[PDB]
Short mmCIF file of C-alpha atoms in Angstrom, two decimals:
data_model
loop_
_atom_site.label_atom_id
_atom_site.label_comp_id
_atom_site.label_asym_id
_atom_site.label_seq_id
_atom_site.Cartn_x
_atom_site.Cartn_y
_atom_site.Cartn_z
CA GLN A 1 261.23 210.47 -65.90
CA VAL A 2 259.71 210.11 -69.38
CA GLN A 3 257.61 213.26 -69.30
CA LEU A 4 256.34 216.35 -71.11
CA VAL A 5 255.93 219.53 -69.00
CA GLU A 6 254.08 222.56 -70.36
CA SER A 7 254.56 226.08 -69.03
CA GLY A 8 253.82 229.66 -69.97
CA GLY A 9 250.03 229.58 -69.77
CA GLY A 10 248.29 232.51 -68.17
CA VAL A 11 245.71 235.25 -68.58
CA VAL A 12 245.90 238.03 -71.22
CA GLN A 13 243.60 240.52 -72.98
CA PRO A 14 242.32 239.82 -76.50
CA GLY A 15 244.90 240.93 -79.05
CA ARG A 16 247.81 240.23 -76.69
CA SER A 17 250.18 237.25 -76.88
CA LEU A 18 251.54 234.30 -74.90
CA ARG A 19 254.51 231.98 -75.44
CA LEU A 20 254.04 228.36 -74.38
CA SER A 21 256.96 226.01 -73.73
CA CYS A 22 257.04 222.23 -73.43
CA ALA A 23 260.09 220.70 -71.72
CA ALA A 24 260.69 217.07 -72.72
CA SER A 25 262.62 214.67 -70.51
CA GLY A 26 263.52 211.02 -70.43
CA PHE A 27 263.70 210.38 -74.18
CA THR A 28 265.51 211.46 -77.35
CA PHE A 29 263.44 214.54 -78.16
CA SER A 30 265.24 215.15 -81.46
CA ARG A 31 263.71 211.95 -82.91
CA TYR A 32 259.99 212.76 -82.44
CA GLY A 33 257.42 214.91 -84.14
CA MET A 34 255.51 216.99 -81.61
CA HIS A 35 252.02 218.46 -81.47
CA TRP A 36 249.92 220.97 -79.60
CA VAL A 37 246.33 220.05 -78.69
CA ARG A 38 243.83 222.19 -76.78
CA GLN A 39 240.60 221.77 -74.83
CA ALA A 40 238.25 224.66 -74.22
CA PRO A 41 236.38 224.65 -70.88
CA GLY A 42 233.76 221.91 -70.90
CA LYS A 43 234.60 221.04 -74.52
CA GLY A 44 236.50 218.30 -76.33
CA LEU A 45 239.99 217.95 -77.76
CA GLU A 46 241.07 220.03 -80.77
CA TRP A 47 244.32 219.55 -82.68
CA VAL A 48 246.29 222.84 -82.92
CA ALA A 49 249.69 222.40 -84.59
CA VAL A 50 252.43 219.94 -85.61
CA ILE A 51 256.17 220.12 -86.21
CA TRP A 52 258.45 217.33 -87.40
CA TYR A 53 261.53 216.14 -85.50
CA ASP A 54 263.78 218.36 -87.65
CA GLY A 55 261.56 221.47 -87.57
CA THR A 56 260.02 220.91 -91.01
CA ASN A 57 256.45 220.27 -92.15
CA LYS A 58 254.80 222.68 -89.74
CA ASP A 59 251.02 222.79 -89.95
CA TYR A 60 248.17 224.44 -88.03
CA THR A 61 244.44 224.19 -87.55
CA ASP A 62 242.76 226.79 -89.72
CA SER A 63 241.52 229.08 -86.95
CA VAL A 64 245.06 229.80 -85.67
CA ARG A 65 246.82 230.27 -89.02
CA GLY A 66 248.68 233.57 -89.21
CA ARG A 67 248.46 233.95 -85.42
CA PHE A 68 250.27 230.95 -83.84
CA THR A 69 253.82 229.76 -84.62
CA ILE A 70 255.15 226.35 -83.55
CA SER A 71 258.91 225.86 -83.17
CA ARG A 72 261.39 223.66 -81.33
CA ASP A 73 264.91 223.75 -79.91
CA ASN A 74 266.31 220.23 -79.95
CA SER A 75 269.42 221.27 -78.01
CA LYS A 76 267.12 222.41 -75.19
CA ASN A 77 264.64 219.52 -75.53
CA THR A 78 261.91 222.16 -75.74
CA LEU A 79 258.85 222.74 -77.96
CA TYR A 80 257.29 226.21 -78.26
CA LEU A 81 253.97 227.73 -79.26
CA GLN A 82 254.03 231.47 -79.92
CA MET A 83 250.41 232.60 -79.65
CA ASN A 84 249.93 236.09 -81.11
CA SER A 85 246.71 238.12 -81.55
CA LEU A 86 244.83 236.01 -79.06
CA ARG A 87 241.04 235.71 -79.28
CA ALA A 88 238.51 234.86 -76.59
CA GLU A 89 237.89 231.52 -78.31
CA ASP A 90 241.57 230.58 -77.77
CA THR A 91 240.75 230.09 -74.08
CA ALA A 92 241.60 226.45 -73.28
CA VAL A 93 244.01 224.09 -71.62
CA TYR A 94 246.93 223.54 -74.05
CA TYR A 95 248.64 220.11 -74.11
CA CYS A 96 251.85 219.15 -75.85
CA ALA A 97 251.85 215.62 -77.20
CA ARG A 98 254.50 213.28 -78.61
CA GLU A 99 253.73 211.61 -81.96
CA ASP A 100 254.81 207.96 -82.10
CA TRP A 101 255.62 205.80 -85.14
CA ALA A 102 251.92 204.89 -85.43
CA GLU A 103 251.00 208.61 -85.67
CA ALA A 104 249.23 208.36 -82.30
CA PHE A 105 249.79 210.72 -79.36
CA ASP A 106 251.47 208.30 -76.97
CA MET A 107 252.50 210.86 -74.32
CA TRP A 108 250.82 214.05 -73.13
CA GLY A 109 251.85 216.77 -70.72
CA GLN A 110 249.71 217.87 -67.81
CA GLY A 111 248.63 220.92 -69.81
CA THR A 112 248.85 224.65 -69.22
CA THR A 113 245.77 226.87 -68.86
CA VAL A 114 245.20 229.91 -71.10
CA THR A 115 242.44 232.47 -70.50
CA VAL A 116 241.85 235.28 -73.01
CA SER A 117 239.53 237.90 -71.55
CA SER A 118 239.07 241.66 -71.42
CA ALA A 119 238.50 241.44 -67.64
CA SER A 120 240.99 242.69 -65.05
CA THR A 121 242.22 240.93 -61.91
CA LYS A 122 239.79 240.94 -59.00
CA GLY A 123 239.79 239.16 -55.67
CA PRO A 124 236.56 237.54 -54.49
CA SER A 125 234.16 238.42 -51.76
CA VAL A 126 233.45 235.38 -49.58
CA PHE A 127 229.99 235.09 -48.07
CA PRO A 128 228.57 232.48 -45.70
CA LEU A 129 225.84 230.00 -46.63
CA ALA A 130 224.38 229.55 -43.15
CA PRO A 131 222.33 226.50 -42.08
CA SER A 132 218.55 226.87 -41.91
CA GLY A 139 218.65 215.18 -39.50
CA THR A 140 221.25 216.52 -41.93
CA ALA A 141 222.35 220.14 -42.24
CA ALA A 142 224.04 221.89 -45.13
CA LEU A 143 226.28 224.94 -44.91
CA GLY A 144 228.91 226.55 -47.10
CA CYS A 145 230.60 229.56 -48.64
CA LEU A 146 229.83 231.66 -51.71
CA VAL A 147 233.00 232.86 -53.44
CA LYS A 148 231.71 235.66 -55.65
CA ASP A 149 233.08 238.01 -58.30
CA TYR A 150 236.70 237.04 -58.89
CA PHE A 151 239.03 236.91 -61.87
CA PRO A 152 240.78 234.93 -63.06
CA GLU A 153 240.46 231.24 -62.27
CA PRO A 154 241.35 229.47 -60.05
CA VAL A 155 240.40 229.69 -56.38
CA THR A 156 240.96 226.91 -53.87
CA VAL A 157 238.55 226.16 -51.03
CA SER A 158 239.25 224.11 -47.91
CA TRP A 159 237.26 223.39 -44.76
CA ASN A 160 238.70 223.65 -41.23
CA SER A 161 242.15 224.07 -42.81
CA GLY A 162 241.77 220.59 -44.34
CA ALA A 163 240.51 218.52 -41.40
CA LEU A 164 236.97 218.49 -42.88
CA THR A 165 236.77 216.65 -46.20
CA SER A 166 233.88 214.18 -45.89
CA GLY A 167 230.68 215.63 -47.30
CA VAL A 168 232.37 218.56 -49.08
CA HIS A 169 231.27 219.61 -52.56
CA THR A 170 233.18 222.46 -54.19
CA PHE A 171 231.33 223.32 -57.36
CA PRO A 172 232.74 224.31 -60.75
CA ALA A 173 232.88 228.08 -61.16
CA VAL A 174 230.39 229.84 -63.40
CA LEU A 175 231.38 232.77 -65.59
CA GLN A 176 228.94 235.63 -64.99
CA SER A 177 227.89 238.19 -67.59
CA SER A 178 230.19 240.67 -65.83
CA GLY A 179 233.14 238.56 -66.94
CA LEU A 180 233.82 237.54 -63.33
CA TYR A 181 233.61 234.06 -61.84
CA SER A 182 231.67 232.74 -58.87
CA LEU A 183 231.56 229.37 -57.17
CA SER A 184 230.13 227.77 -54.07
CA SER A 185 231.52 225.20 -51.69
CA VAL A 186 229.15 223.27 -49.42
CA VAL A 187 229.36 220.52 -46.82
CA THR A 188 226.65 218.44 -45.16
CA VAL A 189 227.03 217.63 -41.46
CA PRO A 190 224.86 216.05 -38.75
CA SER A 191 222.21 218.46 -37.49
CA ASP B 1 238.28 217.60 -93.41
CA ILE B 2 237.42 214.18 -91.99
CA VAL B 3 234.54 214.43 -89.54
CA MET B 4 234.54 211.94 -86.67
CA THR B 5 231.10 211.12 -85.23
CA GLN B 6 231.06 209.36 -81.85
CA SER B 7 228.02 207.85 -80.21
CA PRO B 8 226.47 207.82 -77.76
CA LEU B 9 227.44 211.13 -76.14
CA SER B 10 226.93 209.66 -72.67
CA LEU B 11 227.02 206.02 -71.54
CA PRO B 12 226.03 205.04 -67.99
CA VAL B 13 227.35 201.54 -67.32
CA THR B 14 226.43 199.23 -64.47
CA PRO B 15 229.71 198.05 -62.89
CA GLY B 16 230.78 194.63 -64.15
CA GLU B 17 228.83 194.87 -67.40
CA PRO B 18 230.32 195.47 -70.86
CA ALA B 19 230.45 198.76 -72.73
CA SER B 20 230.62 199.47 -76.44
CA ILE B 21 231.05 202.85 -78.15
CA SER B 22 231.13 203.91 -81.79
CA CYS B 23 233.28 206.22 -83.87
CA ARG B 24 232.31 206.73 -87.52
CA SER B 25 234.42 208.73 -89.96
CA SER B 26 233.25 210.63 -93.03
CA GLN B 27 235.73 208.77 -95.21
CA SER B 28 237.78 205.60 -95.01
CA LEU B 29 240.69 205.66 -92.56
CA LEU B 30 242.26 202.62 -94.26
CA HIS B 31 245.61 203.60 -95.72
CA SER B 32 247.08 201.86 -98.76
CA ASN B 33 249.66 200.33 -96.40
CA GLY B 34 246.87 198.36 -94.70
CA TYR B 35 246.56 200.26 -91.39
CA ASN B 36 243.49 202.13 -90.19
CA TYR B 37 244.77 205.48 -88.90
CA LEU B 38 242.36 205.60 -85.96
CA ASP B 39 243.24 205.96 -82.27
CA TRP B 40 241.25 205.91 -79.03
CA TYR B 41 242.02 208.00 -75.93
CA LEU B 42 240.62 208.08 -72.40
CA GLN B 43 240.59 211.31 -70.39
CA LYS B 44 239.90 210.41 -66.79
CA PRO B 45 238.42 213.15 -64.58
CA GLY B 46 240.89 215.95 -63.94
CA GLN B 47 243.62 214.18 -65.95
CA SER B 48 245.38 214.46 -69.31
CA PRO B 49 244.23 212.22 -72.18
CA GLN B 50 246.01 208.88 -72.46
CA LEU B 51 246.35 206.56 -75.46
CA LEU B 52 244.32 203.34 -75.30
CA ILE B 53 244.21 201.93 -78.84
CA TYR B 54 246.34 202.75 -81.86
CA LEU B 55 245.83 201.95 -85.55
CA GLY B 56 242.30 200.70 -84.93
CA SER B 57 242.89 197.52 -82.91
CA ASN B 58 246.27 197.65 -81.11
CA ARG B 59 246.38 198.09 -77.34
CA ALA B 60 248.85 200.75 -76.20
CA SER B 61 251.36 200.01 -73.45
CA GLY B 62 249.92 199.36 -69.99
CA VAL B 63 246.34 199.03 -71.29
CA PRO B 64 244.28 196.25 -69.63
CA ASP B 65 243.03 193.20 -71.53
CA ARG B 66 239.42 194.34 -71.16
CA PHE B 67 239.83 197.19 -73.71
CA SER B 68 239.61 196.26 -77.37
CA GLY B 69 239.22 198.21 -80.61
CA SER B 70 237.71 196.88 -83.82
CA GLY B 71 236.51 198.02 -87.23
CA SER B 72 237.90 199.02 -90.59
CA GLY B 73 237.20 201.78 -93.09
CA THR B 74 234.64 204.15 -91.55
CA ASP B 75 232.95 202.17 -88.74
CA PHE B 76 234.96 201.63 -85.54
CA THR B 77 234.12 200.31 -82.09
CA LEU B 78 235.75 200.44 -78.67
CA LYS B 79 234.58 197.66 -76.34
CA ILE B 80 235.21 197.33 -72.60
CA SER B 81 234.60 194.08 -70.77
CA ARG B 82 233.50 194.49 -67.15
CA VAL B 83 233.38 198.25 -66.72
CA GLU B 84 234.76 199.35 -63.37
CA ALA B 85 235.11 202.62 -61.53
CA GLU B 86 238.61 203.29 -62.87
CA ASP B 87 237.24 203.30 -66.43
CA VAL B 88 235.06 206.43 -66.09
CA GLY B 89 236.01 209.46 -68.15
CA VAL B 90 235.61 210.82 -71.65
CA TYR B 91 236.66 208.52 -74.50
CA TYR B 92 237.86 210.25 -77.68
CA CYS B 93 238.59 208.84 -81.09
CA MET B 94 241.07 210.51 -83.42
CA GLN B 95 242.06 210.07 -87.05
CA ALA B 96 245.50 210.82 -88.45
CA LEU B 97 245.01 209.81 -92.09
CA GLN B 98 244.65 213.49 -92.97
CA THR B 99 244.73 216.72 -90.93
CA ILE B 100 244.12 215.42 -87.42
CA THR B 101 240.56 215.57 -86.12
CA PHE B 102 238.90 214.23 -82.95
CA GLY B 103 235.45 212.93 -82.23
CA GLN B 104 233.42 214.97 -79.77
CA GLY B 105 233.84 212.42 -76.95
CA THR B 106 231.75 209.74 -75.21
CA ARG B 107 231.39 210.24 -71.46
CA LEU B 108 231.28 206.97 -69.54
CA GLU B 109 229.77 207.14 -66.05
CA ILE B 110 228.74 204.61 -63.40
CA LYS B 111 225.08 203.60 -63.50
CA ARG B 112 223.28 203.23 -60.14
CA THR B 113 219.69 203.16 -58.92
CA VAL B 114 217.76 206.43 -58.59
CA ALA B 115 218.61 208.69 -55.65
CA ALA B 116 216.49 211.79 -55.07
CA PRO B 117 218.24 215.10 -54.31
CA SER B 118 218.30 216.53 -50.82
CA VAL B 119 217.36 220.18 -51.33
CA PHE B 120 218.63 223.18 -49.33
CA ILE B 121 217.99 226.92 -49.84
CA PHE B 122 220.25 229.71 -48.54
CA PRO B 123 219.23 233.38 -48.19
CA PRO B 124 221.74 236.12 -49.05
CA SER B 125 224.06 237.04 -46.21
CA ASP B 126 223.85 240.37 -44.40
CA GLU B 127 227.41 241.16 -45.48
CA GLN B 128 226.50 240.77 -49.15
CA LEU B 129 223.29 242.75 -48.71
CA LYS B 130 225.36 245.71 -47.48
CA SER B 131 227.15 245.63 -50.85
CA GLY B 132 224.01 246.09 -52.98
CA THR B 133 223.48 242.55 -54.35
CA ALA B 134 221.54 239.51 -53.13
CA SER B 135 222.58 235.99 -54.11
CA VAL B 136 220.12 233.21 -53.22
CA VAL B 137 221.59 229.70 -53.42
CA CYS B 138 219.80 226.36 -53.86
CA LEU B 139 221.71 223.11 -53.22
CA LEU B 140 220.58 219.76 -54.66
CA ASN B 141 222.76 217.19 -52.93
CA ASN B 142 223.81 213.63 -53.87
CA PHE B 143 221.27 212.62 -56.51
CA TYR B 144 221.17 210.25 -59.49
CA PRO B 145 220.75 210.46 -62.45
CA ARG B 146 222.34 213.79 -63.38
CA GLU B 147 219.26 215.26 -65.06
CA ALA B 148 217.60 217.71 -62.66
CA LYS B 149 215.64 220.95 -63.02
CA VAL B 150 215.65 223.99 -60.71
CA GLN B 151 212.94 226.66 -61.00
CA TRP B 152 213.27 229.83 -58.94
CA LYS B 153 210.11 231.56 -57.69
CA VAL B 154 209.87 235.00 -56.07
CA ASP B 155 206.47 235.58 -54.43
CA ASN B 156 205.32 232.72 -56.69
CA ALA B 157 206.55 234.49 -59.86
CA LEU B 158 208.64 232.22 -62.10
CA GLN B 159 212.13 233.62 -62.58
CA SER B 160 213.92 233.48 -65.91
CA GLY B 161 217.40 234.52 -67.03
CA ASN B 162 218.72 235.61 -63.60
CA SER B 163 220.25 232.33 -62.39
CA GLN B 164 223.22 230.12 -63.17
CA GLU B 165 224.04 226.59 -62.01
CA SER B 166 226.92 224.12 -62.02
CA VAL B 167 227.18 220.39 -61.31
CA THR B 168 229.94 218.35 -59.71
CA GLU B 169 231.53 215.44 -61.47
CA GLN B 170 230.13 212.07 -60.46
CA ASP B 171 231.30 211.16 -56.96
CA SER B 172 233.61 208.16 -57.06
CA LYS B 173 232.26 206.65 -53.84
CA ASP B 174 228.45 206.79 -54.15
CA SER B 175 228.15 207.61 -57.91
CA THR B 176 225.95 210.67 -57.30
CA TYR B 177 225.90 214.27 -58.51
CA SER B 178 225.27 217.55 -56.73
CA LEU B 179 224.06 220.82 -58.20
CA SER B 180 224.28 224.44 -57.05
CA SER B 181 221.99 227.13 -58.47
CA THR B 182 222.41 230.84 -57.70
CA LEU B 183 219.67 233.44 -58.22
CA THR B 184 221.09 236.98 -58.42
CA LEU B 185 218.99 240.08 -57.71
CA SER B 186 219.53 243.71 -56.90
CA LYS B 187 219.21 244.40 -53.20
CA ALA B 188 216.48 246.84 -54.24
CA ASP B 189 214.52 244.13 -56.06
CA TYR B 190 215.28 241.56 -53.35
CA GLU B 191 213.68 243.78 -50.70
CA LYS B 192 210.49 244.20 -52.75
CA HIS B 193 209.43 240.56 -52.35
CA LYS B 194 208.89 238.18 -49.47
CA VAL B 195 208.90 234.47 -50.40
CA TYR B 196 211.97 233.00 -52.11
CA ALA B 197 211.65 229.41 -53.28
CA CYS B 198 213.48 226.88 -55.43
CA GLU B 199 211.35 224.11 -56.90
CA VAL B 200 213.24 220.96 -57.85
CA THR B 201 212.16 218.36 -60.42
CA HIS B 202 213.96 215.01 -60.54
CA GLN B 203 213.17 211.38 -61.33
CA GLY B 204 213.52 210.40 -57.69
CA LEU B 205 210.70 212.76 -56.66
CA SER B 206 207.07 211.86 -57.35
CA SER B 207 206.32 215.59 -57.63
CA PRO B 208 208.54 218.69 -57.42
CA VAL B 209 210.04 219.58 -54.06
CA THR B 210 210.04 223.22 -52.93
CA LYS B 211 212.29 224.73 -50.28
CA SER B 212 211.64 228.35 -49.39
CA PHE B 213 212.20 231.13 -46.91
CA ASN B 214 210.51 234.39 -45.94
CA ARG B 215 212.84 237.35 -46.35
CA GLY B 216 213.45 238.81 -42.89
CA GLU B 217 212.05 235.92 -40.80
#
């Protein structure tokens, strides 16, 4: 499979670190320049760093200079991003991308999620949203950290009419989301 | 520091009709070698970006005939013939003449006729009330277009700053949105008032719709 596969994302406190890896398969990794690109929640794409096929000509977006280091191991077909002194604004999905001869990003990984937050791990409380010719009911999944939670209905046999909403980040630093389904009264 | 300006930010397209979107750069992307170092990407919902157009006008591998890129210098255009459901997502331009920068994205969505929201209100559960907090939830289901307004009222007093909301992505089958709004109160404050209401404003409604309950009924 011609593929890039990121790993090493996670959840750390501000000032801590994370090491991202990108495993390349299906092509001659040693011939390609490679990049990191990131996308903060609900935001657009931002270029992060570049490294040439031979490890030279490294460069970084200004906000990560002196904190992130890009490197590669051609014998392991792997690209790395060492992310030190993390800041809240580094929270994002991180993608590795292959640079082609046209200097376009012709292949992207699935991305790995990074959350930088002072919060500590907390399971949610789950509360019912009880019904009052169509009825609506659901569940309120409140006060958890970090993302994600998954929500299913009737162990998966109920899918039609389900809406599982994007989580909101509360001022407490904890997340909350709701899942609802409409059914016949 | 080349700044890429995309427009519009959002583009509802009736299925079958053409789409056109703009990317303008703050300096020429035309290299001395004759190429414009400008690429277009599509990020479909929940997916990774994928290359559509490279060097201004060249279709990447596997890209349908109906996508075309044009322009030179600072003014570029991506055109889609016969927009279909599979084309929805955020379209991003990118320049690689200098330090790589992206446009802020154009979100393409399916245009349909107006559908009013179906509104539901949910009181806090007894289990949550035990804990000291009351969350009141308002659901606005399967509406179009996306723009909607929720106003919380507590004994007819307009609430401000104590609610959050989120919206689903456009549903691929019926092209509608849904919205959830949560009002959060102390149990102490919750038990000082009687009528909880969410008033919904939307284009499909000739005047705002209110759903409400009486605490304790």
